[PDB]
Amino acid sequence: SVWKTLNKWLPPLSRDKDWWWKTLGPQINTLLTEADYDLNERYEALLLLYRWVVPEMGPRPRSSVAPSKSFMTDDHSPIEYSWKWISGNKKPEIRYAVELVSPLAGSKQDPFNQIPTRNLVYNLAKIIPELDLTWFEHFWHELLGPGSLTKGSTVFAALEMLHGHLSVKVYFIPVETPDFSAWHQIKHAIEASGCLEALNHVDAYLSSHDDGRQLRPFMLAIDLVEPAASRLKIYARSNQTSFRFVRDVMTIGGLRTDLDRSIEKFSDLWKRALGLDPDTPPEDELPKVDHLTSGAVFNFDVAPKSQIPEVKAYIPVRHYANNDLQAALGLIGYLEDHGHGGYSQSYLRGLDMLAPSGQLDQATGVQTYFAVACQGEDLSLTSYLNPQFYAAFQ
Ligand SMILES: N[C@@H](Cc1c[nH]c2ccccc12)C(=O)O
């Protein structure tokens, strides 16, 4: 085991950092091993984890009560893994998002817990040269800086191990005021970035469409590459849960055509993963669940390369499915029905590793979202996983 070797030989850490190491290391190593990553990449992932992530995770979990209301996960776990399924018998891609913390979180020196994420990004930039911080600095400055109701967090980072190299993504969650909505801030920032037809399409949809007006933008994500190559993803939530609504948002009210076959496949997967009745009418709503993160969630890639924006829909399994085992088996049934299930048992072993002792069959929580994108006639799927350090304190 790569983690066992590194733990045998790296210098021992203090109580909190060591707990985080002996918890996150085995988890990330297990996921990468089930995704068949090369040994060297496993070593790199865990050495990054040991030097830059573990020291900045804060105090170790000690109760079912989290020391923050972090927006990363519903139980406020500050880590979220994700397992992207790749077509054509290829290996899955492993990514993990982290919200680092410091004893200054909440003080007037860092009231929204932003400095550790900044430092992490700068450290990575110093080590990996391919990272570009021009747009990070722009959007940080416009959304979190000295000018700038809270979702519990305002920034976090994501490491994508792309089999060969590492990419970084940054998420800004604007703080809203009665006069400046999150969407207001994100639109003004993007318009200042120096790109804009796709943004205008999203603005028209959100402002004047009957189903677009039910979306509330809340997050912006960028990649730390050259700004011409970076994606601009705007995340939007709605109280609506009918698949008729999800389909219309996927089509942006019809701006996107040539999506009929993939949306049929999407309806199949939606009912399969959520455990719905196969004859469920697309007009029907999911049974109501009141929660800060309930409802349908979507992202709109509004990057200048695109002309028309692209949409990714997130099936919220933690809120509308019956249990993680049912949801995972439904997703895997869809994937294997389309020849994309070479790593189904690897995914299940990862789930069992992440799952609270004996709860895959009884509860939701491990899988947070199944993200769906319509690539031509097929689907692109991503499973988002929550380690549940507090909902399931071991
Ligand atoms: N946890 C928050 C933010 C978030 C993290 N990862 C996400 C992926 C998709 C949508 C939202 C998120 C939410 O569910 O909204």
mmCIF file of C-alpha atoms and ligand atoms in Angstrom:
data_model
loop_
_atom_site.group_PDB
_atom_site.id
_atom_site.type_symbol
_atom_site.label_atom_id
_atom_site.label_comp_id
_atom_site.label_asym_id
_atom_site.label_seq_id
_atom_site.Cartn_x
_atom_site.Cartn_y
_atom_site.Cartn_z
ATOM 1 C CA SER A 1 0.000 0.000 0.000
ATOM 2 C CA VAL A 2 1.329 3.424 -1.025
ATOM 3 C CA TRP A 3 -0.191 5.043 2.044
ATOM 4 C CA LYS A 4 1.227 2.331 4.324
ATOM 5 C CA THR A 5 4.725 2.872 2.912
ATOM 6 C CA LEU A 6 4.555 6.669 3.097
ATOM 7 C CA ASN A 7 3.144 6.460 6.629
ATOM 8 C CA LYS A 8 5.952 4.126 7.684
ATOM 9 C CA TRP A 9 8.597 6.545 6.415
ATOM 10 C CA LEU A 10 7.283 10.124 6.535
ATOM 11 C CA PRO A 11 7.810 12.015 9.820
ATOM 12 C CA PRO A 12 4.957 11.571 12.293
ATOM 13 C CA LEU A 13 2.382 14.333 12.655
ATOM 14 C CA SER A 14 0.587 15.800 15.635
ATOM 15 C CA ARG A 15 -2.772 14.425 16.744
ATOM 16 C CA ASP A 16 -5.081 16.380 14.425
ATOM 17 C CA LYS A 17 -2.872 16.284 11.327
ATOM 18 C CA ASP A 18 -2.182 12.587 11.904
ATOM 19 C CA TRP A 19 -5.901 11.781 12.165
ATOM 20 C CA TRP A 20 -6.508 13.569 8.889
ATOM 21 C CA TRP A 21 -3.555 11.770 7.303
ATOM 22 C CA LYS A 22 -4.577 8.297 8.478
ATOM 23 C CA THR A 23 -8.135 8.966 7.247
ATOM 24 C CA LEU A 24 -7.686 10.799 3.931
ATOM 25 C CA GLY A 25 -4.600 8.903 2.764
ATOM 26 C CA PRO A 26 -6.216 5.464 2.824
ATOM 27 C CA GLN A 27 -9.365 6.859 1.180
ATOM 28 C CA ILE A 28 -7.618 8.649 -1.705
ATOM 29 C CA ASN A 29 -5.223 5.728 -2.166
ATOM 30 C CA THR A 30 -8.107 3.208 -2.275
ATOM 31 C CA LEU A 31 -9.996 5.260 -4.854
ATOM 32 C CA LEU A 32 -6.914 5.704 -7.054
ATOM 33 C CA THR A 33 -6.112 1.995 -6.792
ATOM 34 C CA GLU A 34 -9.635 1.004 -7.793
ATOM 35 C CA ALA A 35 -9.365 3.484 -10.695
ATOM 36 C CA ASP A 36 -6.138 1.666 -11.716
ATOM 37 C CA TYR A 37 -3.869 4.695 -11.420
ATOM 38 C CA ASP A 38 -0.159 4.045 -11.871
ATOM 39 C CA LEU A 39 1.880 3.636 -8.682
ATOM 40 C CA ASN A 40 3.859 6.853 -9.180
ATOM 41 C CA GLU A 41 0.677 8.891 -9.448
ATOM 42 C CA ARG A 42 -0.563 7.389 -6.193
ATOM 43 C CA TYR A 43 2.700 8.430 -4.519
ATOM 44 C CA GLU A 44 2.425 11.985 -5.892
ATOM 45 C CA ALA A 45 -1.202 12.294 -4.799
ATOM 46 C CA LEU A 46 -0.428 11.237 -1.235
ATOM 47 C CA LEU A 47 2.734 13.371 -0.988
ATOM 48 C CA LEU A 48 0.716 16.423 -2.030
ATOM 49 C CA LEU A 49 -1.911 15.389 0.521
ATOM 50 C CA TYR A 50 0.739 15.079 3.235
ATOM 51 C CA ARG A 51 2.495 18.399 2.572
ATOM 52 C CA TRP A 52 -0.282 20.853 1.594
ATOM 53 C CA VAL A 53 -3.725 19.478 2.500
ATOM 54 C CA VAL A 54 -3.326 17.569 5.778
ATOM 55 C CA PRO A 55 -1.680 20.460 7.715
ATOM 56 C CA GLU A 56 -4.594 22.811 6.894
ATOM 57 C CA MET A 57 -7.659 20.644 7.686
ATOM 58 C CA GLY A 58 -8.116 22.033 11.198
ATOM 59 C CA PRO A 59 -9.024 19.985 14.266
ATOM 60 C CA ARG A 60 -9.934 16.350 13.784
ATOM 61 C CA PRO A 61 -13.568 15.197 13.935
ATOM 62 C CA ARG A 62 -14.464 14.296 17.470
ATOM 63 C CA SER A 63 -18.276 14.188 17.396
ATOM 64 C CA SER A 64 -21.266 14.022 15.086
ATOM 65 C CA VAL A 65 -21.098 17.835 15.425
ATOM 66 C CA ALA A 66 -19.059 19.675 12.831
ATOM 67 C CA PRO A 67 -16.969 22.774 13.820
ATOM 68 C CA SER A 68 -18.352 24.710 10.847
ATOM 69 C CA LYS A 69 -21.294 24.946 8.471
ATOM 70 C CA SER A 70 -19.051 24.331 5.471
ATOM 71 C CA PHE A 71 -20.881 24.322 2.122
ATOM 72 C CA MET A 72 -18.814 21.409 0.747
ATOM 73 C CA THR A 73 -21.200 18.676 1.945
ATOM 74 C CA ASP A 74 -24.560 18.491 3.710
ATOM 75 C CA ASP A 75 -23.008 17.243 6.979
ATOM 76 C CA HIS A 76 -20.232 19.860 6.463
ATOM 77 C CA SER A 77 -17.463 17.414 5.708
ATOM 78 C CA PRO A 78 -14.704 19.577 4.211
ATOM 79 C CA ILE A 79 -13.812 16.927 1.597
ATOM 80 C CA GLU A 80 -15.727 15.670 -1.440
ATOM 81 C CA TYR A 81 -14.420 12.988 -3.785
ATOM 82 C CA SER A 82 -15.668 12.398 -7.297
ATOM 83 C CA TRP A 83 -15.392 9.492 -9.710
ATOM 84 C CA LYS A 84 -15.858 10.423 -13.361
ATOM 85 C CA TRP A 85 -16.890 7.547 -15.624
ATOM 86 C CA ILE A 86 -15.135 7.564 -19.009
ATOM 87 C CA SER A 87 -16.553 5.869 -22.090
ATOM 88 C CA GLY A 88 -14.746 3.243 -24.130
ATOM 89 C CA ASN A 89 -13.385 0.941 -21.384
ATOM 90 C CA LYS A 90 -11.088 3.700 -20.115
ATOM 91 C CA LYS A 91 -10.122 4.252 -16.476
ATOM 92 C CA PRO A 92 -12.214 6.551 -14.269
ATOM 93 C CA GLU A 93 -10.894 9.983 -13.329
ATOM 94 C CA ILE A 94 -10.523 10.734 -9.619
ATOM 95 C CA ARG A 95 -10.877 14.245 -8.268
ATOM 96 C CA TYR A 96 -11.314 15.666 -4.809
ATOM 97 C CA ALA A 97 -12.447 19.069 -3.598
ATOM 98 C CA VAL A 98 -11.166 20.452 -0.296
ATOM 99 C CA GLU A 99 -12.001 23.499 1.815
ATOM 100 C CA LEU A 100 -8.950 24.154 3.975
ATOM 101 C CA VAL A 101 -9.320 26.045 7.243
ATOM 102 C CA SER A 102 -7.256 27.963 9.803
ATOM 103 C CA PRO A 103 -7.821 29.205 13.374
ATOM 104 C CA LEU A 104 -8.668 32.608 11.805
ATOM 105 C CA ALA A 105 -11.908 31.371 10.197
ATOM 106 C CA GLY A 106 -14.657 33.670 11.448
ATOM 107 C CA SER A 107 -12.330 36.322 12.877
ATOM 108 C CA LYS A 108 -12.047 39.744 11.264
ATOM 109 C CA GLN A 109 -8.769 38.562 9.715
ATOM 110 C CA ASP A 110 -10.570 35.940 7.606
ATOM 111 C CA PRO A 111 -14.350 36.042 8.251
ATOM 112 C CA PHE A 112 -15.268 33.682 5.393
ATOM 113 C CA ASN A 113 -12.296 31.246 5.557
ATOM 114 C CA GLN A 114 -10.530 32.219 2.338
ATOM 115 C CA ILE A 115 -6.791 32.450 3.151
ATOM 116 C CA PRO A 116 -5.952 28.694 3.348
ATOM 117 C CA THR A 117 -7.458 28.043 -0.100
ATOM 118 C CA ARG A 118 -5.465 30.975 -1.510
ATOM 119 C CA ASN A 119 -2.253 29.619 0.003
ATOM 120 C CA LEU A 120 -2.948 26.120 -1.328
ATOM 121 C CA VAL A 121 -3.452 27.465 -4.841
ATOM 122 C CA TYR A 122 -0.218 29.479 -4.686
ATOM 123 C CA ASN A 123 1.755 26.489 -3.422
ATOM 124 C CA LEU A 124 0.436 24.324 -6.255
ATOM 125 C CA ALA A 125 1.237 27.076 -8.755
ATOM 126 C CA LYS A 126 4.817 27.177 -7.500
ATOM 127 C CA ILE A 127 5.193 23.370 -7.965
ATOM 128 C CA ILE A 128 3.065 22.628 -11.106
ATOM 129 C CA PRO A 129 4.064 25.210 -13.765
ATOM 130 C CA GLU A 130 1.109 24.580 -16.120
ATOM 131 C CA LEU A 131 -1.226 26.408 -13.669
ATOM 132 C CA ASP A 132 -2.157 30.017 -14.535
ATOM 133 C CA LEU A 133 -3.459 32.345 -11.832
ATOM 134 C CA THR A 134 -4.572 35.394 -13.883
ATOM 135 C CA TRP A 135 -8.314 34.554 -13.808
ATOM 136 C CA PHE A 136 -8.038 33.179 -10.230
ATOM 137 C CA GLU A 137 -6.740 36.611 -9.161
ATOM 138 C CA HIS A 138 -9.442 38.435 -11.177
ATOM 139 C CA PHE A 139 -12.380 36.432 -9.872
ATOM 140 C CA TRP A 140 -10.968 36.267 -6.348
ATOM 141 C CA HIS A 141 -10.566 40.020 -6.373
ATOM 142 C CA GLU A 142 -14.055 40.702 -7.732
ATOM 143 C CA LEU A 143 -15.982 38.127 -5.660
ATOM 144 C CA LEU A 144 -14.022 37.782 -2.380
ATOM 145 C CA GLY A 145 -11.654 40.731 -2.033
ATOM 146 C CA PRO A 146 -11.809 44.077 -0.229
ATOM 147 C CA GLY A 147 -14.864 45.322 -2.164
ATOM 148 C CA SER A 148 -17.170 42.247 -2.343
ATOM 149 C CA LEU A 149 -26.279 35.990 3.956
ATOM 150 C CA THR A 150 -23.826 33.114 3.393
ATOM 151 C CA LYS A 151 -23.977 29.514 2.158
ATOM 152 C CA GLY A 152 -21.468 28.502 4.869
ATOM 153 C CA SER A 153 -18.392 28.815 2.614
ATOM 154 C CA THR A 154 -17.102 31.224 -0.001
ATOM 155 C CA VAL A 155 -14.224 29.385 -1.728
ATOM 156 C CA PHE A 156 -12.768 25.939 -2.213
ATOM 157 C CA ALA A 157 -10.314 24.117 -4.459
ATOM 158 C CA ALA A 158 -10.346 20.856 -6.399
ATOM 159 C CA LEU A 159 -7.527 18.558 -7.482
ATOM 160 C CA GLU A 160 -8.154 16.512 -10.621
ATOM 161 C CA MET A 161 -5.715 13.645 -11.156
ATOM 162 C CA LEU A 162 -5.998 13.303 -14.934
ATOM 163 C CA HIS A 163 -3.790 10.213 -15.385
ATOM 164 C CA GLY A 164 -0.503 11.900 -16.221
ATOM 165 C CA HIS A 165 -0.925 15.411 -14.856
ATOM 166 C CA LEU A 166 -2.794 17.402 -12.233
ATOM 167 C CA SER A 167 -5.385 20.123 -12.864
ATOM 168 C CA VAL A 168 -6.788 22.581 -10.340
ATOM 169 C CA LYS A 169 -10.284 24.057 -10.194
ATOM 170 C CA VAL A 170 -11.458 26.887 -7.956
ATOM 171 C CA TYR A 171 -15.025 27.474 -6.723
ATOM 172 C CA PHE A 172 -16.233 30.905 -5.597
ATOM 173 C CA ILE A 173 -19.465 31.064 -3.601
ATOM 174 C CA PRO A 174 -20.341 34.772 -3.423
ATOM 175 C CA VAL A 175 -21.808 36.193 -0.230
ATOM 176 C CA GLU A 176 -25.182 37.746 -1.020
ATOM 177 C CA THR A 177 -26.465 41.135 0.142
ATOM 178 C CA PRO A 178 -29.996 42.544 -0.279
ATOM 179 C CA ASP A 179 -28.710 44.746 -3.121
ATOM 180 C CA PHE A 180 -26.199 42.369 -4.818
ATOM 181 C CA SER A 181 -27.308 38.831 -5.633
ATOM 182 C CA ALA A 182 -24.749 36.108 -6.304
ATOM 183 C CA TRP A 183 -25.798 36.130 -9.963
ATOM 184 C CA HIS A 184 -25.282 39.895 -10.084
ATOM 185 C CA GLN A 185 -21.717 39.553 -8.785
ATOM 186 C CA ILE A 186 -20.859 36.626 -11.058
ATOM 187 C CA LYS A 187 -22.183 38.374 -14.187
ATOM 188 C CA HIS A 188 -20.289 41.590 -13.437
ATOM 189 C CA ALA A 189 -17.115 39.618 -12.723
ATOM 190 C CA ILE A 190 -17.311 37.622 -15.960
ATOM 191 C CA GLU A 191 -18.087 40.780 -17.935
ATOM 192 C CA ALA A 192 -14.940 42.328 -16.425
ATOM 193 C CA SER A 193 -12.812 39.210 -17.117
ATOM 194 C CA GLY A 194 -12.062 40.243 -20.705
ATOM 195 C CA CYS A 195 -13.602 37.312 -22.584
ATOM 196 C CA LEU A 196 -19.523 36.783 -24.354
ATOM 197 C CA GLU A 197 -22.515 35.358 -26.271
ATOM 198 C CA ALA A 198 -22.954 32.297 -24.031
ATOM 199 C CA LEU A 199 -23.126 34.421 -20.890
ATOM 200 C CA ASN A 200 -25.829 36.556 -22.488
ATOM 201 C CA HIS A 201 -27.775 33.398 -23.396
ATOM 202 C CA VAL A 202 -27.662 32.248 -19.766
ATOM 203 C CA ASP A 203 -28.734 35.707 -18.570
ATOM 204 C CA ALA A 204 -31.704 35.749 -20.964
ATOM 205 C CA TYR A 205 -32.729 32.255 -19.881
ATOM 206 C CA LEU A 206 -32.491 33.056 -16.160
ATOM 207 C CA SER A 207 -34.301 36.381 -16.505
ATOM 208 C CA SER A 208 -37.109 35.869 -19.017
ATOM 209 C CA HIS A 209 -37.824 32.121 -19.266
ATOM 210 C CA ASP A 210 -40.612 30.655 -17.148
ATOM 211 C CA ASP A 211 -38.421 27.741 -16.067
ATOM 212 C CA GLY A 212 -35.190 29.723 -16.166
ATOM 213 C CA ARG A 213 -36.613 32.192 -13.661
ATOM 214 C CA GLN A 214 -36.807 29.393 -11.076
ATOM 215 C CA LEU A 215 -33.017 28.966 -10.963
ATOM 216 C CA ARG A 216 -30.949 30.832 -8.382
ATOM 217 C CA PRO A 217 -27.226 31.076 -9.310
ATOM 218 C CA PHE A 218 -24.934 30.467 -6.302
ATOM 219 C CA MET A 219 -21.468 29.412 -7.503
ATOM 220 C CA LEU A 220 -18.771 30.040 -10.082
ATOM 221 C CA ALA A 221 -16.002 27.591 -10.980
ATOM 222 C CA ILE A 222 -12.883 28.151 -13.069
ATOM 223 C CA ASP A 223 -9.846 26.114 -14.092
ATOM 224 C CA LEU A 224 -6.334 27.327 -13.310
ATOM 225 C CA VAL A 225 -5.182 27.284 -16.922
ATOM 226 C CA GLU A 226 -4.676 30.046 -19.479
ATOM 227 C CA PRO A 227 -7.945 32.046 -19.548
ATOM 228 C CA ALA A 228 -8.612 31.158 -23.194
ATOM 229 C CA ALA A 229 -8.663 27.459 -22.222
ATOM 230 C CA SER A 230 -10.478 27.722 -18.885
ATOM 231 C CA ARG A 231 -14.122 26.859 -18.364
ATOM 232 C CA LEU A 232 -16.547 29.278 -16.709
ATOM 233 C CA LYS A 233 -19.161 27.196 -14.887
ATOM 234 C CA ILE A 234 -22.095 28.951 -13.201
ATOM 235 C CA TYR A 235 -24.037 26.735 -10.779
ATOM 236 C CA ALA A 236 -27.776 27.267 -10.296
ATOM 237 C CA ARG A 237 -30.325 25.608 -8.000
ATOM 238 C CA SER A 238 -34.114 25.332 -8.229
ATOM 239 C CA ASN A 239 -36.965 24.067 -6.072
ATOM 240 C CA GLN A 240 -38.361 22.267 -9.122
ATOM 241 C CA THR A 241 -37.723 18.550 -9.509
ATOM 242 C CA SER A 242 -39.902 17.410 -12.412
ATOM 243 C CA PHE A 243 -37.895 15.782 -15.171
ATOM 244 C CA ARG A 244 -39.813 18.006 -17.609
ATOM 245 C CA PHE A 245 -38.091 20.936 -15.857
ATOM 246 C CA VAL A 246 -34.694 19.215 -15.767
ATOM 247 C CA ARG A 247 -34.983 18.466 -19.486
ATOM 248 C CA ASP A 248 -35.930 22.047 -20.334
ATOM 249 C CA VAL A 249 -32.972 23.377 -18.358
ATOM 250 C CA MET A 250 -30.696 20.875 -20.117
ATOM 251 C CA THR A 251 -31.943 22.294 -23.419
ATOM 252 C CA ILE A 252 -31.837 25.912 -22.134
ATOM 253 C CA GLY A 253 -35.448 26.242 -23.222
ATOM 254 C CA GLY A 254 -34.570 24.925 -26.687
ATOM 255 C CA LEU A 255 -31.412 26.940 -27.482
ATOM 256 C CA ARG A 256 -29.746 23.528 -27.701
ATOM 257 C CA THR A 257 -31.250 21.090 -30.223
ATOM 258 C CA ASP A 258 -29.963 17.684 -31.462
ATOM 259 C CA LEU A 259 -30.272 16.358 -27.921
ATOM 260 C CA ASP A 260 -33.307 14.051 -28.189
ATOM 261 C CA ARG A 261 -31.590 10.657 -27.937
ATOM 262 C CA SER A 262 -29.283 11.674 -25.094
ATOM 263 C CA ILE A 263 -32.206 13.184 -23.177
ATOM 264 C CA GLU A 264 -34.164 9.938 -23.584
ATOM 265 C CA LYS A 265 -31.131 8.174 -22.107
ATOM 266 C CA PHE A 266 -31.071 10.836 -19.388
ATOM 267 C CA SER A 267 -34.709 10.181 -18.452
ATOM 268 C CA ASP A 268 -33.915 6.485 -18.203
ATOM 269 C CA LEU A 269 -30.928 7.106 -15.920
ATOM 270 C CA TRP A 270 -32.889 9.630 -13.835
ATOM 271 C CA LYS A 271 -35.638 7.167 -12.985
ATOM 272 C CA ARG A 272 -33.118 4.344 -12.509
ATOM 273 C CA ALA A 273 -30.858 6.219 -10.086
ATOM 274 C CA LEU A 274 -33.635 7.900 -8.105
ATOM 275 C CA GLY A 275 -35.572 4.632 -7.739
ATOM 276 C CA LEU A 276 -38.662 6.074 -9.426
ATOM 277 C CA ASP A 277 -41.481 4.096 -11.036
ATOM 278 C CA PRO A 278 -40.583 3.468 -14.716
ATOM 279 C CA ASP A 279 -43.925 4.945 -15.852
ATOM 280 C CA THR A 280 -43.465 8.104 -13.748
ATOM 281 C CA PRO A 281 -44.771 11.039 -15.824
ATOM 282 C CA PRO A 282 -42.048 13.613 -16.564
ATOM 283 C CA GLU A 283 -44.441 16.343 -15.378
ATOM 284 C CA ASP A 284 -44.517 14.959 -11.821
ATOM 285 C CA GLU A 285 -42.386 16.455 -9.059
ATOM 286 C CA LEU A 286 -40.184 14.430 -6.764
ATOM 287 C CA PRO A 287 -41.671 14.162 -3.251
ATOM 288 C CA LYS A 288 -40.800 17.351 -1.402
ATOM 289 C CA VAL A 289 -37.542 17.541 0.555
ATOM 290 C CA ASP A 290 -36.794 20.806 2.347
ATOM 291 C CA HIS A 291 -33.029 21.424 2.519
ATOM 292 C CA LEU A 292 -30.448 24.103 1.675
ATOM 293 C CA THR A 293 -29.211 21.906 -1.189
ATOM 294 C CA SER A 294 -32.408 20.156 -2.283
ATOM 295 C CA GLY A 295 -34.013 20.689 -5.664
ATOM 296 C CA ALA A 296 -32.463 20.301 -9.070
ATOM 297 C CA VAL A 297 -28.953 21.690 -9.542
ATOM 298 C CA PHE A 298 -27.338 22.591 -12.865
ATOM 299 C CA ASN A 299 -24.081 24.167 -14.112
ATOM 300 C CA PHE A 300 -23.797 26.348 -17.250
ATOM 301 C CA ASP A 301 -20.412 26.400 -18.980
ATOM 302 C CA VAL A 302 -20.395 29.899 -20.467
ATOM 303 C CA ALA A 303 -16.847 29.930 -21.886
ATOM 304 C CA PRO A 304 -16.008 32.098 -24.927
ATOM 305 C CA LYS A 305 -15.049 29.060 -27.046
ATOM 306 C CA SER A 306 -18.633 27.793 -26.953
ATOM 307 C CA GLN A 307 -21.040 30.338 -28.557
ATOM 308 C CA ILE A 308 -23.926 28.352 -27.037
ATOM 309 C CA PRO A 309 -23.540 27.445 -23.332
ATOM 310 C CA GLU A 310 -23.315 23.848 -22.173
ATOM 311 C CA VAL A 311 -25.342 22.363 -19.324
ATOM 312 C CA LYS A 312 -24.575 19.731 -16.702
ATOM 313 C CA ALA A 313 -27.409 18.410 -14.517
ATOM 314 C CA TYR A 314 -26.882 16.931 -11.040
ATOM 315 C CA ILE A 315 -29.209 14.104 -9.964
ATOM 316 C CA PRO A 316 -29.465 14.654 -6.149
ATOM 317 C CA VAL A 317 -29.330 11.032 -4.897
ATOM 318 C CA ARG A 318 -28.782 11.987 -1.231
ATOM 319 C CA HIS A 319 -32.184 13.604 -1.087
ATOM 320 C CA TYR A 320 -34.491 11.735 -3.438
ATOM 321 C CA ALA A 321 -33.177 8.160 -3.743
ATOM 322 C CA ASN A 322 -33.823 5.401 -1.232
ATOM 323 C CA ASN A 323 -30.274 4.309 -0.319
ATOM 324 C CA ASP A 324 -26.745 4.435 -1.675
ATOM 325 C CA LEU A 325 -26.713 0.758 -2.699
ATOM 326 C CA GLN A 326 -29.955 1.149 -4.665
ATOM 327 C CA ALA A 327 -28.692 4.325 -6.317
ATOM 328 C CA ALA A 328 -25.300 2.853 -7.178
ATOM 329 C CA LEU A 329 -26.831 -0.308 -8.624
ATOM 330 C CA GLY A 330 -29.245 1.783 -10.694
ATOM 331 C CA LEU A 331 -26.455 3.930 -12.105
ATOM 332 C CA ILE A 332 -24.369 0.820 -12.801
ATOM 333 C CA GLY A 333 -27.294 -0.834 -14.539
ATOM 334 C CA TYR A 334 -27.568 2.156 -16.853
ATOM 335 C CA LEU A 335 -23.796 2.204 -17.493
ATOM 336 C CA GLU A 336 -23.596 -1.532 -18.218
ATOM 337 C CA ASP A 337 -26.635 -1.274 -20.472
ATOM 338 C CA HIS A 338 -24.496 1.110 -22.570
ATOM 339 C CA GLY A 339 -21.185 -0.770 -22.477
ATOM 340 C CA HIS A 340 -19.550 1.594 -19.976
ATOM 341 C CA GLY A 341 -19.338 -0.550 -16.846
ATOM 342 C CA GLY A 342 -15.798 -1.916 -16.739
ATOM 343 C CA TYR A 343 -15.191 -0.351 -13.296
ATOM 344 C CA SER A 344 -18.546 -1.053 -11.603
ATOM 345 C CA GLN A 345 -17.157 -3.357 -8.907
ATOM 346 C CA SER A 346 -14.254 -0.954 -8.336
ATOM 347 C CA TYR A 347 -16.812 1.781 -7.735
ATOM 348 C CA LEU A 348 -18.700 -0.453 -5.306
ATOM 349 C CA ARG A 349 -15.506 -1.216 -3.376
ATOM 350 C CA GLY A 350 -14.835 2.514 -3.162
ATOM 351 C CA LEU A 351 -18.379 3.031 -1.886
ATOM 352 C CA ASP A 352 -17.934 0.334 0.738
ATOM 353 C CA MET A 353 -14.670 1.977 1.825
ATOM 354 C CA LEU A 354 -16.341 5.402 2.143
ATOM 355 C CA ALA A 355 -19.607 4.160 3.618
ATOM 356 C CA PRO A 356 -20.443 4.359 7.333
ATOM 357 C CA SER A 357 -20.168 0.896 8.831
ATOM 358 C CA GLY A 358 -23.252 -0.932 7.559
ATOM 359 C CA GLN A 359 -25.294 1.872 6.020
ATOM 360 C CA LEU A 360 -25.116 1.519 2.211
ATOM 361 C CA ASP A 361 -28.405 -0.407 2.230
ATOM 362 C CA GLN A 362 -30.229 1.702 4.845
ATOM 363 C CA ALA A 363 -29.467 5.319 4.040
ATOM 364 C CA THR A 364 -28.336 7.874 1.534
ATOM 365 C CA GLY A 365 -25.360 10.127 2.120
ATOM 366 C CA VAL A 366 -22.322 8.494 0.544
ATOM 367 C CA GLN A 367 -23.273 9.515 -2.995
ATOM 368 C CA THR A 368 -24.199 13.203 -3.139
ATOM 369 C CA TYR A 369 -24.781 13.708 -6.896
ATOM 370 C CA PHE A 370 -24.772 11.836 -10.173
ATOM 371 C CA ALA A 371 -23.778 14.539 -12.663
ATOM 372 C CA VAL A 372 -24.993 14.088 -16.254
ATOM 373 C CA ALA A 373 -23.815 15.849 -19.423
ATOM 374 C CA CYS A 374 -25.192 15.282 -22.936
ATOM 375 C CA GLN A 375 -22.274 14.558 -25.286
ATOM 376 C CA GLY A 376 -23.804 14.148 -28.745
ATOM 377 C CA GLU A 377 -25.970 11.042 -28.404
ATOM 378 C CA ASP A 378 -24.426 9.719 -25.146
ATOM 379 C CA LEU A 379 -24.133 10.679 -21.478
ATOM 380 C CA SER A 380 -21.095 11.706 -19.444
ATOM 381 C CA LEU A 381 -21.520 10.697 -15.787
ATOM 382 C CA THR A 382 -19.742 11.661 -12.576
ATOM 383 C CA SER A 383 -20.392 10.297 -9.101
ATOM 384 C CA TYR A 384 -19.821 12.733 -6.226
ATOM 385 C CA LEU A 385 -18.978 11.085 -2.901
ATOM 386 C CA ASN A 386 -19.108 12.362 0.682
ATOM 387 C CA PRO A 387 -16.930 10.672 3.331
ATOM 388 C CA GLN A 388 -19.381 11.863 6.041
ATOM 389 C CA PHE A 389 -16.882 12.521 8.821
ATOM 390 C CA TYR A 390 -19.624 13.927 11.060
ATOM 391 C CA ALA A 391 -22.908 12.385 9.876
ATOM 392 C CA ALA A 392 -21.263 9.039 10.533
ATOM 393 C CA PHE A 393 -18.637 9.629 13.194
ATOM 394 C CA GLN A 394 -16.566 6.457 13.579
HETATM 395 N N1 LIG B 1 -22.481 21.034 -1.491
HETATM 396 C C1 LIG B 1 -22.999 22.187 -2.194
HETATM 397 C C2 LIG B 1 -21.942 22.719 -3.151
HETATM 398 C C3 LIG B 1 -21.390 21.665 -4.106
HETATM 399 C C4 LIG B 1 -20.218 20.949 -3.945
HETATM 400 N N2 LIG B 1 -20.070 20.144 -4.991
HETATM 401 C C5 LIG B 1 -21.122 20.312 -5.849
HETATM 402 C C6 LIG B 1 -21.438 19.690 -7.087
HETATM 403 C C7 LIG B 1 -22.600 20.059 -7.759
HETATM 404 C C8 LIG B 1 -23.461 21.029 -7.227
HETATM 405 C C9 LIG B 1 -23.153 21.636 -6.013
HETATM 406 C C10 LIG B 1 -21.967 21.261 -5.323
HETATM 407 C C11 LIG B 1 -24.244 21.779 -2.973
HETATM 408 O O1 LIG B 1 -24.689 20.597 -2.895
HETATM 409 O O2 LIG B 1 -24.818 22.640 -3.702
#
